[PDB]
Amino acid sequence: RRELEELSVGSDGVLIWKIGSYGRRLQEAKAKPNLECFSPAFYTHKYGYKLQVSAFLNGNGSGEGTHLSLYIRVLPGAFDNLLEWPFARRVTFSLLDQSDPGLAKPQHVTETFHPDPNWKNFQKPGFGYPKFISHQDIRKRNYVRDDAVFIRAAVELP
């Protein structure tokens, strides 16, 4: 099963994470203030950085109670000794608009950041948006569809 997590590699540095049972998990996240959902660990590229995305459906920090919060973190990886540190690749989050791309060009909610080289987790073994999207905005369009949401984390490969 950990050898399953080692097969988890990004596709052109992209992870797409489906959070199903959205309705229910939001309720648990209201009932419990530090309820954090985790993506599978994934590699930026085959012999690269191991990352993991986390989300708070009912927000964290400045977003607590009001927003979806999205974070990413570096994990200990098998190949850390062959990589540049600190981790400095640009990270882009998207909450996907689940509309048919044959009808209209879907409008993803998207933010991008460059890792700050002073944050401890980006150095050799979460960081992101506490207020990524508001509870009111997430019910617009098709961000929530069939009781699931899609979180995308794309890591810019050199």
Binding site: G61, E111, G126, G128, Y129, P130, K131
Partner: peptide, 5 residues
Amino acid sequence: RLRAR
């Protein structure tokens, strides 16, 4: 906009 936690 980017921040810890």
